[PDB]
Design a protein around this ligand. Structure first.
Ligand SMILES: Cc1c(C(=O)O)[nH]c2ccc(Br)cc12
Ligand SMILES: Cc1c(C(=O)O)[nH]c2ccc(Br)cc12
Ligand SMILES: Cc1c(C(=O)O)[nH]c2ccc(Br)cc12
Ligand SMILES: Cc1c(C(=O)O)[nH]c2ccc(Br)cc12
Ligand SMILES: Cc1c(C(=O)O)[nH]c2ccc(Br)cc12
Ligand SMILES: Cc1c(C(=O)O)[nH]c2ccc(Br)cc12
Ligand SMILES: Cc1c(C(=O)O)[nH]c2ccc(Br)cc12
Ligand SMILES: Cc1c(C(=O)O)[nH]c2ccc(Br)cc12
Ligand SMILES: Cc1c(C(=O)O)[nH]c2ccc(Br)cc12
Ligand SMILES: Cc1c(C(=O)O)[nH]c2ccc(Br)cc12
Ligand SMILES: Cc1c(C(=O)O)[nH]c2ccc(Br)cc12
Ligand SMILES: Cc1c(C(=O)O)[nH]c2ccc(Br)cc12
Ligand SMILES: Cc1c(C(=O)O)[nH]c2ccc(Br)cc12
Ligand SMILES: Cc1c(C(=O)O)[nH]c2ccc(Br)cc12
Ligand SMILES: [Cl-]
Ligand SMILES: [Cl-]
Ligand SMILES: [Cl-]
Ligand SMILES: [Cl-]
Lengths: 212, 212, 212, 212
């Protein structure tokens, strides 16, 4: 598409998008155009409003577009075109991406003892309620664990809530400990969001006992 | 995919899918698997049920799956696997497609007079509330009108309701009537649903006057 | 979206779209904008052309857009905006839908004899190479058969060619003949395209013998 | 879905997926099922093979599935089910995600001089050829720059190649430098891939002059 301001909008929270160049109050020659999961191609919204879209997005007195509670289907492109008093046209172009932050990740079914030289199920990490899905990763003594290397293997599962569409992730870690290692290793799991500059979330550690 | 029974389910109505070969009442060794717009890949549902899916679909005493009110996101594949008292396993495979019937189509902005040898806007046909979209067509004295032939031209528009996802269609007919024709032609518009074996819906006719 | 001329384009065939209002030859102030399965949102194409898109769509001397061989990914919206010599702006808006016609449908594995009062597999109808999928239906003595009524049942299967994306459909008919019926019924199968005003295709008939 | 091994497969490279529990060589009771961008729901592949799928994926002598050159449409789920000599059944479940690494990112149109207290276009960063899209980010003297804070603003653009589907990203940085700052700041841009554990790519720095 074209150059846009990129906007990240949390599901369930309001969103206000500015119509650049609009007069501060009516009268206003402005039009919003949106192409989102709610539209077939472009929908035009005007300051007069009306109809079903008044339940979703309305133009404010200052020309900004207001959504009271963003949902997954609002992801897309939002554009404004305004004329000011002198007649200069100004365009605004926004790319809206939506997200939700899951609960703190948790480790369930952790092993209290591990045996060297055979595979052991260390635990299952679980994260509930994210959008977009994001990813789970395992760490040993603070350091990321790379699957399929050093006797490490991981299996993963994704499901979605049938009404909200939010993701639940599960990640099961198996390790084949090498003889001679630290008998009290510290494992942990982290959730990394799909969108950039969002913080990772991490579990409490587990410290199983390894028997040589 | 595999061979399945096709099921056509009206939006907002209940749906009961039978689990072939299940015992008539509990105890029952059976399992449903669904891959629909509500799932990431397959979801398994069992007679014990539980969790968020209990708000969407539950297994009945006789083993059938029940949805109290189908939505667009329930389109997809539904399978049951059951063992009877003797141990014969029986599979059921359903492909569920959902639909909604729009209101009666209407013609708006119809012309009361037409002029031979020039293009005239005959009218705009509108249909509100269909799923899947379906199509609009124009008829002259009962016979379908073919666009881009005999001075006929049509333009079309599709919108979706921002909350229900249902389609509204609009179709604008222009005709350049030829000199020497019927001075009182009868036009009408019909809505043809997307799904097979469903009846078309037709507008009342309009009978403009053609001036030579 | 907005009002558009609806265009149906056969896969593998060229497509020429007119830029209304363009001068007949260069110089030309015109721009094409496309949003199709090949684009992220809108792509702009100009008479100078250039780059990868020259392998897909180019602007002709008269301003029309030319695709030498349409594919599934070309389905979408194509718009032109032109200024003429006087400076009048003219917009063209096209909604392009693509299709392919399958081979003649065929019945395989047909029954030569049927037995009254029990279920019989009449045959399997097969259609290869359609886009969009379209549907298969069974007819008895010219009259459509309605599944789940009068001892009729149908199962269906859809697959896609892994490289071309075209659909193959299969439809298996079972009938439980009622005692006292015509001992030499005539069955046939028809393919109905997904797009409007396209002709149905039908199989040769089969005439099994019914034993009372 | 179910628990699976995640597989990350580079576009254009071969992929071999193991069928756990298969005999080392024929005879072999095993079957692969795939649901990818090439299939309508599940496709079954067998050691005998045949048809169009032989051009895409084949079962090897040892039972593994081989794709000679992965594409975007091979993203999806791949499962094998095998019985050994004794009759133990073993399942393998793989979730295949595909990727491509773009060329080194580059800054174009960089500013050689900046003026304090007004907005300046620092440069445009460009990355060509990624899958999935990934993201571009700006850094000042090694630290990430956060948009809409401290006189920083960014606009972004995404295009796809019309034949390969690979992404090109562009990111334009504007800064209003504050009076009193470093007169020789160092800016750079980095590409962060969509998939986890893949390395970022970074541009050479630019060091404009700031005029107080
Ligand atoms: C000039 C104008 C009117 C009007 O005054 O008729 N409405 C508008 C909506 C968007 C953009 Br740009 C310009 C206008
Ligand atoms: C108070 C109000 C006015 C007005 O003062 O005219 N217009 C609006 C448009 C959208 C939303 Br939400 C609130 C208002
Ligand atoms: C082409 C375009 C851009 C851009 O290139 O940034 N922004 C816009 C905002 C509103 C409308 Br209406 C059109 C555009
Ligand atoms: C997109 C979406 C919503 C929503 O838009 O609210 N709800 C869902 C429930 C299950 C799956 Br799968 C996807 C969704
Ligand atoms: C044997 C069996 C159990 C059980 O072990 O009780 N549960 C089941 C669910 C579906 C199908 Br088919 C078979 C079974
Ligand atoms: C009444 C009832 C029983 C029961 O009697 O055990 N089980 C159920 C499962 C689904 C729905 Br809906 C209703 C019932
Ligand atoms: C699929 C769908 C639903 C639903 O599933 O309720 N609602 C919608 C509103 C607008 C657009 Br576009 C699509 C949908
Ligand atoms: C005026 C004009 C130029 C130009 O002469 O600079 N190029 C164009 C492309 C599309 C449309 Br409408 C108008 C123009
Ligand atoms: C011959 C030719 C000219 C020219 O004569 O300048 N321009 C073109 C643009 C597209 C395609 Br396809 C063919 C031509
Ligand atoms: C808004 C619009 C329509 C319509 O409403 O029919 N057609 C177009 C053709 C080209 C460009 Br650029 C914009 C439009
Ligand atoms: C859309 C499509 C193409 C194409 O665009 O050529 N090829 C395919 C092969 C299998 C499946 Br499923 C879909 C496609
Ligand atoms: C028993 C068996 C046959 C056969 O009957 O020879 N083919 C198979 C393919 C996959 C899996 Br698990 C088991 C079998
Ligand atoms: C050489 C060969 C055999 C065989 O030796 O039987 N089977 C195969 C299946 C797939 C691909 Br690729 C190569 C082979
Ligand atoms: C998925 C894809 C392919 C491919 O699978 O080769 N090619 C493309 C060209 C443009 C756009 Br948009 C998407 C694709
Ligand atoms: Cl819409
Ligand atoms: Cl799910
Ligand atoms: Cl693009
Ligand atoms: Cl398929």
């Amino acid at each position: 598409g074209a150059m846009a301001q990129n906007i990240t909008a949390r599901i369930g929270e309001p969103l206000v998008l500015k119509c650049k160049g609009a007069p501060k109050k009516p009268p206003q020659r402005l039009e919003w155009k949106l192409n989102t999961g709610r539209t077939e191609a472009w929908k035009v919204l005007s300051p007069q409003g009306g109809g079903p879209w008044d339940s979703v997005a309305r133009v404010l007195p200052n020309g900004s577009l207001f959504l009271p509670a963003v949902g997954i289907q609002d992801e897309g492109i939002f554009r404004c075109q305004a004329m000011n008093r002198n007649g200069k046209e100004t365009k605004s172009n926004y790319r809206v991406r939506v997200y939700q932050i899951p609960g703190k990740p948790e480790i369930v079914d952790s092993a209290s003892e591990l045996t060297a030289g055979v595979p052991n199920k260390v635990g299952t990490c679980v994260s509930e309620g994210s959008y977009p899905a994001g990813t789970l990763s395992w760490h040993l003594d603070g350091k990321p664990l790379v699957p399929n290397e050093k006797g490490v293997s991981v299996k993963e599962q994704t499901r979605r809530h049938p009404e909200t569409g939010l993701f639940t992730l599960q990640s099961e870690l198996m390790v084949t400990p090498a003889r001679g290692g630290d008998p009290r290793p510290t494992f942990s799991c982290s959730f990394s969001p799909g969108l950039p500059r969002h913080r990772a979330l991490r579990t409490a550690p587990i410290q199983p006992r390894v028997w040589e």
